[PDB]
Amino acid sequence: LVPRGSHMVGLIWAQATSGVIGRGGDIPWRLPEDQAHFREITMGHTIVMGRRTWDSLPAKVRPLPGRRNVVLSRQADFMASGAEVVGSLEEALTSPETWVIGGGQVYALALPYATRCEVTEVDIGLPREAGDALAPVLDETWRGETGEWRFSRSGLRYRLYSYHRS
Ligand SMILES: NC(=O)c1ccc[n+]([C@@H]2O[C@H](COP(=O)([O-])OP(=O)(O)OC[C@H]3O[C@@H](n4cnc5c(N)ncnc54)[C@H](OP(=O)(O)O)[C@@H]3O)[C@@H](O)[C@H]2O)c1
Ligand SMILES: CCc1nc(N)nc(N)c1OCC1(COc2ccccc2CCC(=O)O)COC1
């Protein structure tokens, strides 16, 4: 349970088995089961994303519905129509429950404050290339639950992990 006076911070991402989460300003696969899972977890909560992740959303879809959208930028003239832009995680993490939804820079930034991670791993063989955005690496303070491999309607295997720490 999440007491309303707390500030719970979770990270949620989908990665290939290599750790790649983004390339060329997009996610280099599509998995409908992961889209549904991402929405089930985040709906109703504040979502925090990096400026480059906001840029990756088509103008017609953003801000993402059903969730308070917060965008991190250091640029005083960057504006996100329909959403709030803030310059730090301290300013972004005011809600009782916040999901950090990417990308690679913002996961690394938020990791020291996070107590939950929800991961989808997609069994697509995408090697890491220079410039890719990557999932954060989780140290031994994190305890994980790994689901069995499942199979998507799209013909890719995937599995879910849930990590927690104190
Ligand atoms: N697979 C997934 O689950 C998933 C999820 C989300 C995104 N993605 C992908 O990941 C890629 C984007 O990731 P990315 O690592 O390139 O970028 P990102 O983390 O989404 O955004 C980086 C931007 O955040 C801002 N920022 C970073 N550190 C900050 C700090 N300390 N204070 C304030 N603002 C800060 C900066 O904005 P300014 O430059 O404006 O200062 C920086 O350029 C895309 O390919 C996207 O499609 C994948
Ligand atoms: C789903 C990808 C994803 N999966 C996990 N597990 N974690 C993430 N953080 C993540 O990326 C979430 C973003 C990309 O969402 C997309 C992308 C394509 C299609 C549909 C959506 C959801 C739209 C919505 O939610 O209405 C929203 O900005 C990045």
Tell me the domain boundaries of the chain.
1-166
Q: What is the 3-state secondary structure (H, E, C) of the chain?
A: CCCCCCCEEEEEEEEECCCEEEECCECCCCCHHHHHHHHHHHCCCEEEEEHHHHHHCCCCCCCCCCCEEEEECCCCCCCCCCCEEECCHHHHCCCCEEEECCCHHHHHHHHHHCCEEEEEEECCCCCCCCCCEECCCCCCCCEEEECCCEECCCCCEEEEEEEECC
Only one residue has tokens 């140290």, namely 139
Take atom 20 of ligand 2 and give the residue whose Cα is closest.
Answer: 35
Q: Which of 36, 12, 10, 3 has its CA nearest to residue 102?
A: 12
Binding site for substrate, by residue number, is 12-14, 34, 39, 67, 107, 120
d(CA 138, CA 135): 9
Q: For residues 134 and 21, is the Cβ–Cβ distance under 8 A?
A: yes
Pick the atom of ligand 1 nearest to 120's CA: 3
Q: Check if 109 has its Cβ closer than 6 Å to any atom of ligand 1.
A: yes
Take atom 36 of ligand 1 and give the residue whose Cα is closest.
Answer: 73
What is the CB neighbour count within 10 angstroms for residue 68?
16
Taking CB atoms within 8 Å and a gap of at least 24, the contacts of 38-42 are 38/12, 38/14, 38/101, 38/120, 39/66, 41/12, 41/99, 41/118, 42/12, 42/67, 42/99, 42/101
- Write down the experimental method used for this entry: X-ray
What is the CB neighbour count within 10 angstroms for residue 25?
11
Query: How would you classify residue 129: left for phi > 0, otherwise alpha for psi between -120 and 50, otherwise beta?
Result: beta
Which ligand number lies closest to the CA of residue 35?
2
